[PDB]
Structure formats: structure tokens, C-alpha cells
Design a protein around this ligand. Structure first.
Ligand SMILES: *[C@@H]1O[C@H](CO)[C@@H](O[C@@H]2O[C@H](CO)[C@@H](O)[C@H](O)[C@H]2NC(C)=O)[C@H](O)[C@H]1NC(C)=O
Lengths: 46, 50, 49
């Protein structure tokens, strides 16, 4: 009432990984943008 | 005016500072816009998937 | 027009620019763009040209 770090640790590790997964949807990896509506509606399918 | 997307549009209550074009959410997804003509903020909730 | 070493530079502002109508003024000899196809530019919007 005044120690559950194992449980806390587990509950956390998973959130830190799920956030890193979403934060990758905004990297270019060597492209002109991160949005398909900027690469699509701005170029030819070729 | 350039922002292409899909979803449900809803009346907002977020005070978009007179100079903020849109709303940015952690993990970087568009979640609010401002209508160019009437200049009101609208939230963009995602359609239903599963 | 201008000479090349002191080349002109216009800045366009708020307007309705139809790029496809510019595309077929029917006398050109090079119409080449890299960032974007010209016909797809008829549904974008910018801040300064
Ligand atoms: C584009 O035009 C519309 C009207 O055609 C403008 O809307 C006006 O917005 C002001 C807000 O400052 C209102 O007080 C007016 O009543 C609106 N007019 C109408 C007819 O609704 C709009 O502001 C214009 N775009 C910009 C960027 O100014």
C-alpha cells in the first residue's frame, strides 16, 4: 500500500516496441517523402 | 488542398492557433484539418476495419 | 525575354493555374518535368511558384 517492477517492465517493453513500429511510418528510407499520396499523386506509375 | 485521405469528419473543439494549418498526432498521423473556405477545425476519425 | 546571365524570375501568387491548358499551347520543343507528371499537377496546390 505504501515493488511490481517485473510486471511493470513487461507491460512497458511491449508499448515501447509498438510505438517504434508506428514511428517508422514516417521515414523516407531514401525516397522523396513518406506519404504515398505525395509520391502517387505526383508521378507516373512507371 | 493537397491532404488526401479517408475517414469520418467531425466538428472539433481544438483551438487551432491562428496560424496552424493542421493537427499532428504522436506517431505522426494526420488527425485534424482546417477547412480552407470556412476556417474551422475538423477531426478525422478512421473508418472501421478489423 | 531576358538574357541568360541576368535571367528573369517571376513569382506567382494566388490564382487559378491550369497546367494542361499550358501544356497544349502547341508550339513547344521541350516540355520535360522530373518531380511530377504535368497532367497530375491539375489537382495539387502550392505556396509559391
Ligand atoms: C475564401 O472565400 C470565402 C468566401 O467565399 C471566405 O470565407 C469568409 O471567411 C470569413 C472569415 O474571416 C468570414 O467572416 C466570411 O463570412 C466568409 N465568407 C463566406 C461567404 O462564407 C474565405 O475566408 C476565403 N479564403 C481565405 C483564405 O480568406
Amino acid at each position: 500500500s505504501s515493488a511490481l517492477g517485473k510486471l511493470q517492465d513487461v507491460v512497458n517493453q511491449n508499448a515501447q516496441a509498438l510505438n517504434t513500429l508506428v514511428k517508422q511510418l514516417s521515414s523516407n528510407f531514401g525516397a522523396i517523402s513518406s506519404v504515398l499520396n505525395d509520391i502517387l499523386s505526383r508521378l507516373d506509375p512507371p | 488542398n493537397g491532404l488526401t485521405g479517408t475517414g469520418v469528419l467531425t466538428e472539433s473543439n481544438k483551438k487551432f492557433l491562428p496560424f496552424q494549418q493542421f493537427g499532428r498526432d504522436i506517431a505522426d498521423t494526420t488527425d485534424a484539418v482546417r477547412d480552407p473556405q470556412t476556417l474551422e477545425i475538423l477531426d478525422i476519425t478512421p473508418c472501421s476495419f478489423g | 525575354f531576358a538574357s541568360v546571365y541576368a535571367w528573369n524570375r517571376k513569382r506567382i501568387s494566388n490564382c487559378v493555374a491550369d497546367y494542361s491548358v499550358l501544356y497544349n499551347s502547341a508550339s513547344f520543343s521541350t516540355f520535360k518535368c522530373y518531380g511530377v507528371s504535368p497532367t497530375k499537377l491539375n489537382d495539387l496546390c502550392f505556396t509559391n511558384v
